[PDB]
Structure 1
Amino acid sequence: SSKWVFEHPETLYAWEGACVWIPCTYRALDGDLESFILFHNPEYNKATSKFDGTRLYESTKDGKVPSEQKRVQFLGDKNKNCTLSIHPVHLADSGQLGLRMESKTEKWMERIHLAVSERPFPPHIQLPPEIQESQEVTLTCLLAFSCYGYPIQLQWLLEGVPMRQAAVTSTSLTIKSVFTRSELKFSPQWSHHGKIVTCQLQDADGKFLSADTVQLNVKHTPKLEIKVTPSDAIVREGDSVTMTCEVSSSNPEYTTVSWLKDGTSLKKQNTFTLNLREVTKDQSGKYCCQVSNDVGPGRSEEVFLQV
């Protein structure tokens, strides 16, 4: 009994004040249409074996001459298209819509769910699983809404400030999926680790509607800071010098630590402190530590000993 076959999304989302555009097609194997009624939450009376409830559209009354001012409009034909449109949609419209249709001696009822919330629902940011420094990533912000009579826009904010990188916004309004996607590419620095990325929903005039925030987990090599005593780095032979190596940032945590004298690894220096108890003249160069993690080896600044 596959007499009727409808192609449309199973659920359409919107909010109070906006509009909703419902794509819909059908194929009636039993000729063209004779009547089309649009119920809101129809209740089937088991006694009379008919459908009751508030009728939002009747093809025999408010659809005999299309009014163009109608809030609820049927944009379809007699045997193919059942695209509905409520502009503006209200909270009292949220529910289950019924597409009661009749042809020659047979009739059919079709359900469409219309979820309308009082406030604009937030979008959603889809992050890559591993974000690493100097590697371009594509952040995806999706929104399960798109209507013609109410244009929207998605805005990317980093740390509460718009991002200079351009985005690409695309909308799909088909019988399969309805959404507004905005993708943004940018090469993250190590400092972006722990920073907040926001995707804001705004109308045509740019008024804030909703948003979704995330915190970046940017892998990076250990950024190091080196200290030396004395600060002036001046000494005589035999006297002591101490250098310290402090990991200021590393994602993930560090693994090994070694020291370098003009690019030469001093052996047995597996700690963050470099003690030169009795110095000479042949030393006196440029020192730096190397701390690594899963990401790789990170190097600190250079200090001129010069003795």
Structure 2
Amino acid sequence: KWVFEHPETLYAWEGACVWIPCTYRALDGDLESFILFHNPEYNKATSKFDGTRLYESTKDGPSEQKRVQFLGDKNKNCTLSIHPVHLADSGQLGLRMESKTEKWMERIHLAVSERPFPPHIQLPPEIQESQEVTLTCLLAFSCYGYPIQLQWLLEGVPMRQAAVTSTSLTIKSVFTRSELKFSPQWSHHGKIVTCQLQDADGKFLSADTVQLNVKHTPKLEIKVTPSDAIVREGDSVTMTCEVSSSNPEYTTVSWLKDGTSLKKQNTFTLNLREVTKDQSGKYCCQVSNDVGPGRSEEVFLQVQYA
């Protein structure tokens, strides 16, 4: 029973580095030899592991200027460092360990892409206007030798809101995260948000893009005929209610005169026939969707005597 604790799969790209936190417990006790293979192959005939050796405790254990470094010890630490990492390093890292009475091979998968891979934006399934939402950008990479930055963009412009970067680099998980808190408005709907990955000097590396879907109450434009909203008694007045933006789709419409609802006016058009001076006042329409009700600007109807 050999117990190992490591991220089990590490990601990087050509020219960057990888840092592999690793602890272990050998019930047999202290180690006597350590070999780090790359893509180790097992020889059934000789009962030994063949393949490329990247580190040997007998030979490489040094000059401090070495691409592959073993940073652990013969006890409880198996931390590895490859700086820089190459596409040829991609595959199986085989930690060939031997205790006094037993030998163990612990494999750690290393996935290296030729170019930087994009980050991943995670956002809640329902985003509503005027509620603080945290956008999360997640990159499955973090290495000391290669500092990086995550940059938020809105329609190609750097976003005003401060974003907070945090990095995990543990036996459990390796990532770089950026969280941006902002309250979206109805105008943010349909816009694109970009999370840019940059190196320490701001050089563009990769990016992920999402188009925002922001729920909002209906936004309305009211129009009146005649346009000046001034009529004599007996004339006819027509007011229409137009939905400029609504997410999701609107479901009901109502009309109000001076704060009181006009009964049986449940269409997007209000027709006042043979108007009396009574019907002067302030008019508006209200359109509701699943998010809530919206109201248009008020129209001041002036019915002048005779």
Q: TM-score over 0.5 for the alignment?
A: yes
**1:49: Cα distance to partner?**
1.4
Given candidates 2, 27, 30, the residue that maps to 2:28 is 30
Match of 2:172, SS?
Answer: coil
Deviations 1:193-250 (A, max 9, x none): 1111111111101111111111222111100001111111221111111111100011
> In 2, Cα distance between the equivalents of 1:226 and 1:147?
57
> In 2, Cα distance between the equivalents of 1:9 and 1:61?
27
> In 2, Cα distance between the equivalents of 1:177 and 1:23?
9
Superposed CA RMSD: 1.1
Deviations 1:64-86 (A, max 9, x none): xx211100000111111110000
> In 2, Cα distance between the equivalents of 1:134 and 1:71?
51
Deviations 1:248-299 (A, max 9, x none): 0111111111111111211111111111120111222111101111111110
Consecutive unaligned residues of structure 1, counting only runs of 5 or more, are none
> In 1, Cα distance between the equivalents of 2:69 and 2:292?
61
Task: Out of 195-204 and 97-106, give the one that drifted further.
Answer: 97-106
Deviations 1:34-58 (A, max 9, x none): 2211110011111211111111111
Aligned residue pair count: 303
Deviations 1:93-146 (A, max 9, x none): 000011111232432211110111111111111111211111111111111111
> In 2, Cα distance between the equivalents of 1:134 and 1:121?
33
> In 1, Cα distance between the equivalents of 2:142 and 2:260?
61
Task: Out of 31-40 and 12-21, give the one that drifted further.
Answer: 31-40
> In 1, Cα distance between the equivalents of 2:98 and 2:251?
73
Task: Out of 108-117 and 31-40, give the one that drifted further.
Answer: 31-40
Identity value in percent: 100
Match of 2:278, SS?
Answer: coil
**1:178: Cα distance to partner?**
0.7
**1:169: Cα distance to partner?**
0.9
**1:31: Cα distance to partner?**
3.0
Given candidates 293, 298, 307, the residue that maps to 2:294 is 298
Query: Runs of 4+ in structure 1 displaced over 3 angstroms?
Result: none
> In 2, Cα distance between the equivalents of 1:5 and 1:116?
26
Whether 2:120 is the aligned partner of 1:120: answer: no
> In 1, Cα distance between the equivalents of 2:263 and 2:100?
93
Consecutive unaligned residues of structure 2, counting only runs of 5 or more, are none
Deviations 1:161-188 (A, max 9, x none): 1111111111111111111111111111
Q: Structure 2 length as normaliser, TM-score?
A: 0.96
**1:27: Cα distance to partner?**
1.5
